[PDB]
Symmetry: D2
Subunit: 134 residues, 4 copies
């Protein structure tokens, strides 16, 4: 797992940029915004995006004190391609995150964790190579 600090945490108007290249034979990857980088036990997760290649899903959820929330899955299409570069932008807005892939809006995730400035970590794991974080 990769953990990157987000100086100052999240606020409305704040954008997280994640570019990378999907692996040639991917099973899955995940990109999460979390409160601190603790792994034992695992930090509270404001949003986890998990891309699953076998059935072409974008699964979203949160985790608060070890408790998983409602999994959300609605998608217009599955945006990732094996061996291809991608650009994920997570935009923090007052009521929600808006998530873009390659410039296109893919889904919104309404806040379960309300304390936005505490969301100060990006965690990335799985079948990709990260080329840019901004």
């Amino acid at each position: 797992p990769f953990c990157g600090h987000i100086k100052g945490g999240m606020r409305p108007g704040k954008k997280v940029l994640v570019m990378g290249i999907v692996d040639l034979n991917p099973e899955s990857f995940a990109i999460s915004l979390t409160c601190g980088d603790s792994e034992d036990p695992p930090a509270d997760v404001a949003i986890e995006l998990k891309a699953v290649f076998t059935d072409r899903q974008l699964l979203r959820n949160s985790c608060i004190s070890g408790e998983r929330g409602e999994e959300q899955s609605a998608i217009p299409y599955f945006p990732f391609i094996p061996d291809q570069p991608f650009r994920v932008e997570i935009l923090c807005e007052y009521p929600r995150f808006r998530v873009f892939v390659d410039g296109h809006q893919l889904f919104d995730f309404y806040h379960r964790i309300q304390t936005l400035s505490a969301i100060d970590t990006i965690k990335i794991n799985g079948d990709l190579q990260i080329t840019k974080l901004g």
Copy 2:
């Protein structure tokens, strides 16, 4: 649900044709091949294909004596478009069904029910209208 008879049941080399039109605002539909048309209590299901539109899944399972097997979801893409005509072909081969949508191979489902000639029913329900069965 619609139930249609398949005279003589299934055998390697036999193809079932289903043409229809997806509803304008679909939620899900299912197309199943079953052993007889009993609904209470339900016939044994050799293959059920459920298309789910919100997260663009093609879910496959079987049912024997009321027991569902392992659901399968692997897809190269989701093939159905709201308000668009479709052509589904379920080809029975010796070890599996091979399923085609609009001429394209979408998945294999290996036989769980072994007695193919007893698979003599197609069941259709959900957000579509059927135009042809053959």
Copy 3:
């Protein structure tokens, strides 16, 4: 599927009593509290309790405008016995339903449908015989 009216719907302090006998060879049964008794298309579900005998689960969920929420399954034990009489009591509290089986507290389910007086229907289906409603 049986439906029964609950005059005046739910409110804090109100209890729903369901007494019955599990069938000799049960697969599952379900007890739901719903907003009206419409079946096609199905009334909004405030809580559905589904007892699954094979792997001894109590699964809880809601349904709003045909959309299911997050299924909940946490249990201290599985409380039902084939061919045995039972007593379910659903206590509506301010924040949640508290569910008792044979006098013992089994789980809490927090309100998703907030308009409690609109929850005026009990729906019962599956492998049981109902002996009392109150």
Copy 4:
């Protein structure tokens, strides 16, 4: 995980004994019999038993070339208790593994991996401490 070698692998009549104590606040643990101890990439799994405490499940499956088979879950009851010692016995028979907990038969798992002598590793992970392997 812990991995232990099982000299000569499995054969009919061979018993694996695992004793331990469940942690005070357990989420899950797993006990697996596998073909070699490779983690990268993970050995074939003949049987994985996963105990889940929240909803009291004993989930069984296999993994062959990274592909998980059909999850099995049927149970007479959930046998494990937080902060309490347990005795697991996996009996290898010709057609199946028979699993006992505290002297009681819990379930059978019919062989998916047919080459029994190749199953020569026990893998253990999760919210327990192991006191005996024999």
